[PDB]
Structures are given as C-alpha cells and as structure tokens.
Amino acid sequence: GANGPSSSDMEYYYKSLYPFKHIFNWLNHSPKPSRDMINREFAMAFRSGAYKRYNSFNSVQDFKAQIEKANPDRFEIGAIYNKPPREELKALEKELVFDIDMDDYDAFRTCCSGAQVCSKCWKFISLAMKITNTALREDFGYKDFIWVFSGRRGAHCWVSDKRARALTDVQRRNVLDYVNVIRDRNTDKRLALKRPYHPHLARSLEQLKPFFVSIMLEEQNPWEDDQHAIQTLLPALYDKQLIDSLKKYWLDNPRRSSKEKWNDIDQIATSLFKGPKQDSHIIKLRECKEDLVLMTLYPKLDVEVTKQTIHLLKAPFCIHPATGNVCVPIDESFAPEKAPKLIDLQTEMEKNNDVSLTALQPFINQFQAYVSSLLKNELGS
Ligand SMILES: [Zn+2]
C-alpha cells in the first residue's frame, strides 16, 4: 500500500522471513562463529530516528534474538574490530563496498520523473554495475562480490575477497578514485577528461558506446526538448562558435530529435572548421562526444561509503521503509519491479505458511549459493 510497513509488519518479517543464518555465515567467513562476527559492529536505525551503534552478535541465534527484540527499521553492517563492539576500538577488516543510485542520472532520463523508476532507466544502473564489475574482476582480480538492491532505485556492491576486506583506508580511497572517473557530476560543464584516456576509460568507452544510441538518443531522447539540449547537450561541446551556431539552428528548427541534434553537431562543425587545421577540430569534437557518452552512462558512484573501513552500510534483505521492498541480491535479470514487497510476502505466507514457498525464497537461494562460493574461496586449497 501507500504506507510503508508497520512495526508489527517488521516484527513478522524478522521473526519468520529475514535470512539471519545466511547473512551471519556471509559475514563470519566460516561455519563456526568467530570474531569476524563477534567483533563486528552493527548499527540499528529505529523508526523514531534513534540510531544505535556498536552492537555485536555472537551466533545466528543471538543476531536473530537481538534484531527481533529491537525491531529496527533497518540495520547496518560495519567493520571487524580488535575487541567486541558491544563491550579504543581499532578496525581491522571490512568488505569493500560501493553504492550507486539513480539521482545523478536524472538529467538524462525522460521515462521517469521525481522518485520514479522503471526498467528503462534501470539500464543506467545495470550499466554502472557492468563497468564497475569489469574493473573489479579484470583490474583488481576480485572474484567474490555481489550487488544488492537498495530498496527504491539504487544498488550496493559488497566485495568479500580476503584482499578487499583487508584494505586500508588509503587503499580503499585509491580503489574509489580508480573507478570514479567522472569526478565532477555537474552537467552544465564539459568534462574535458584527460587525454590520452587511461586504459580503463578506453575500455569503458568501448563497452558503453553500443548503448548510447539505444538508451540515450532513442529510448530516453532527453535532447528533443530544446531547453534541455541547451542545458545538457551544448555544454559538453568545446567551441563557442559551434555552440552558438547550433543554438541558432535549433531555434530556427525546433524539436529536432536527440538523434537529429547529435548529427547536426557534426554537420555544423564540418561547415565551421575548414582548412589544414580542421583535423585538430575534428579530433576535439570526437573527444567531446566520447566524454559525453561517459557523462551520461559511466557509473556515478556515491563515493563516500567506499572510503573508510569503519563506514556502516545497510544490510542485504533489510526492508525499505517507504516502498516496502526487500533489499534483495541482484542477478542479470533484475529490475526493481522484481523485488518482493513485504506486504505481498505476508499475503503469500497466509496461503502457504513458510518462507520457502514465497517469492523471497529464490533470492535467499541466490544468496546462499553465493555464500557457499565465498566460503570455498576462503579455504583455498
Ligand atoms: Zn524510468
């Protein structure tokens, strides 16, 4: 319904649906309880706005009993410390995390407005995960990571490789800076990315180019609106004369599609830049356009959470308090409409009273299989 889950709804969820055993095993890195759980901080966020840090749990039974008793709207996972938080604390390890959310893509989408989301603009997030995954796998050699829907229109990545868990804050900042190519999110300005591109950017550009026509020019088409083209297409260009000529042209000939404007840029540039210097201008326009492909489609991380081993991040399978969606793990097929809603799970448990019979169970199965694979890598040979 329009209202999010009630307190008694949350009580039912933690009692009968939340997968405490698998989340415990994922964070403990072993089948016997160890200090990777006993010394790990969890924070609880209450419906009142209260926020309690430095909880810690010692077994799946204790994690479940404390969460059920507190009944928080969500809880968050922090670092593994040298002493148990519930009892000066030095952080030793924590999964490396990233957060991507639909906000910074809003200027280029037309399918949805405000807090809306749909499978079309979700492609911005699917691409963000694709490019981030390529860097994590190919450049950092990480093998154990999973993305989790954050409940409305974003996702979180949890990387559990032992190397990633042991990174220091300096190292985490260096990983973040490696992936966070678009540093300045402002669209009223041209990126002027450093040339020649670093091989990661060249690689990312080749991955993203085939999606630009189909997503940006055609599906979203944000530049058919002449004021939007002035606001976010023109600023990406490098030459004041080109920009003015295009402005006059689009004034004289209104509502040309994004595809038509995209080609108009080349046509007008070809007429403006002439003579043996022109090859230089051709290159600069191409580079501006490549940079704009990255401005529209390259992952725009919400950077802060990645940078420090102590930072807390919402646990997978928490309930979003406004949408009532479960924050489920994401596979290739996911879009937000596929996330189960708690009220729907409650209605299901009425006819078939076991979690294993609900729409939550495939996501729990995906997560359990993931946890299995991580534990196997943990042992090594
Ligand atoms: Zn949409």
Sign of CA dihedral 197, 198, 202, 208: negative
**Cα–Cα distance measured from residue 101 to residue 301, given in angstroms and rounded to the nearest whole number:** 7
Report yes or no: 79 and 310 within 8 Å, Cβ to Cβ: yes
**Cα–Cα distance measured from residue 75 to residue 166, given in angstroms and rounded to the nearest whole number:** 23
Residue 137's alpha-carbon distances to 131, 144, 381, in angstroms, are: 10, 9, 21
Residue in 154, 73, 155 with CA at minimum distance from that of residue 115: 154
Centroid of ligand 1 to alpha carbon of 216 (angstroms): 12
DSSP string, 154-191: EEEEEE--HHHHT--HHHHHHHHHHH-------TTS--
> Could you identify the residue written with the tokens 């909880």?
55
DSSP character for 91?
E
**Domain total of the chain:** 1
Structure token digits, residue 71: 């009944």
**Cα–Cα distance measured from residue 35 to residue 41, given in angstroms and rounded to the nearest whole number:** 11
Indicate which CATH number applies to the domain containing 335.
Answer: 3.90.920.10
Centroid of ligand 1 to alpha carbon of 110 (angstroms): 7
What region does 216 belong to: left with phi over 0, alpha with psi -120 to 50, or beta?
alpha
Count the neighbouring beta carbons within 10 Å of the beta carbon of residue 245.
Answer: 17
Count the neighbouring beta carbons within 10 Å of the beta carbon of residue 361.
Answer: 16
Structure token digits, residue 299: 């992952």
The alpha helices in 197-319, defined as continuous H runs, are 199-211, 226-228, 240-252, 258-272, 278-297
Q: What is the resolution of this structure in A?
A: 1.6
- What lies within 8 Å, CB to CB, of 306 at 6+ separation is 96, 97, 98, 99, 172, 173, 175, 176
**Cα–Cα distance measured from residue 325 to residue 10, given in angstroms and rounded to the nearest whole number:** 12
The identity of residue 146, as a single letter, is I
Residue in 333, 295, 297 with CA at minimum distance from that of residue 132: 297
The identity of residue 302, as a single letter, is D
Report yes or no: 373 and 144 within 8 Å, Cβ to Cβ: yes
**Cα–Cα distance measured from residue 343 to residue 347, given in angstroms and rounded to the nearest whole number:** 6
**Cα–Cα distance measured from residue 49 to residue 102, given in angstroms and rounded to the nearest whole number:** 24
**Cα–Cα distance measured from residue 142 to residue 135, given in angstroms and rounded to the nearest whole number:** 9
Residue in 167, 186, 144, 201 with CA at minimum distance from that of residue 307: 167
Centroid of ligand 1 to alpha carbon of 334 (angstroms): 14
**Cα–Cα distance measured from residue 100 to residue 377, given in angstroms and rounded to the nearest whole number:** 27
> Could you identify the residue written with the tokens 């943990």?
378
CA atoms in the 13 A half-sphere facing the CB of 356: 1
SS3 56: coil
Structure token digits, residue 273: 């830049």
Instruction: Write the burial class of residue 12 (CB in 10 Å: 0-12 exposed, 13-18 middle, 19+ buried).
Output: middle
The identity of residue 280, as a single letter, is S
**Cα–Cα distance measured from residue 39 to residue 36, given in angstroms and rounded to the nearest whole number:** 6
Residue in 101, 151, 147 with CA at minimum distance from that of residue 329: 147
Centroid of ligand 1 to alpha carbon of 119 (angstroms): 6
Catalytic residue status for 101: yes
**Cα–Cα distance measured from residue 216 to residue 238, given in angstroms and rounded to the nearest whole number:** 20
**Cα–Cα distance measured from residue 129 to residue 300, given in angstroms and rounded to the nearest whole number:** 10
The identity of residue 68, as a single letter, is E
The β-bridge partners of 76 are: 43, 314
Centroid of ligand 1 to alpha carbon of 217 (angstroms): 15
**Cα–Cα distance measured from residue 73 to residue 67, given in angstroms and rounded to the nearest whole number:** 10
Q: Tell me which of 73, 99, 291, 348 is the catalytic residue.
A: 99
Residue in 217, 295, 307 with CA at minimum distance from that of residue 261: 217
DSSP character for 353?
-
**Cα–Cα distance measured from residue 25 to residue 308, given in angstroms and rounded to the nearest whole number:** 23
Q: Residue 312 — φ and ψ, nearest 5°?
A: -90, 145
Catalytic residue status for 99: yes
Catalytic residue status for 260: no
Task: Show the domain range for 164.
Answer: 1-381
Listed in order, strand segments (DSSP E) in the chain are 40-45, 51-55, 74-81, 91-93, 96-101, 145-149, 154-159, 313-314, 329-330
Report yes or no: 325 and 343 within 8 Å, Cβ to Cβ: no
Centroid of ligand 1 to alpha carbon of 214 (angstroms): 14
Q: Tell me which of 9, 101, 139, 260 is the catalytic residue.
A: 101
Cβ-count burial 145-172 (b if 16+ within 10 Å, e if not): bbbbbbbbbbbbbbbbbeebbebeeeeb
User: Residue 32, Cα to own-chain centre: how many angstroms?
Assistant: 32
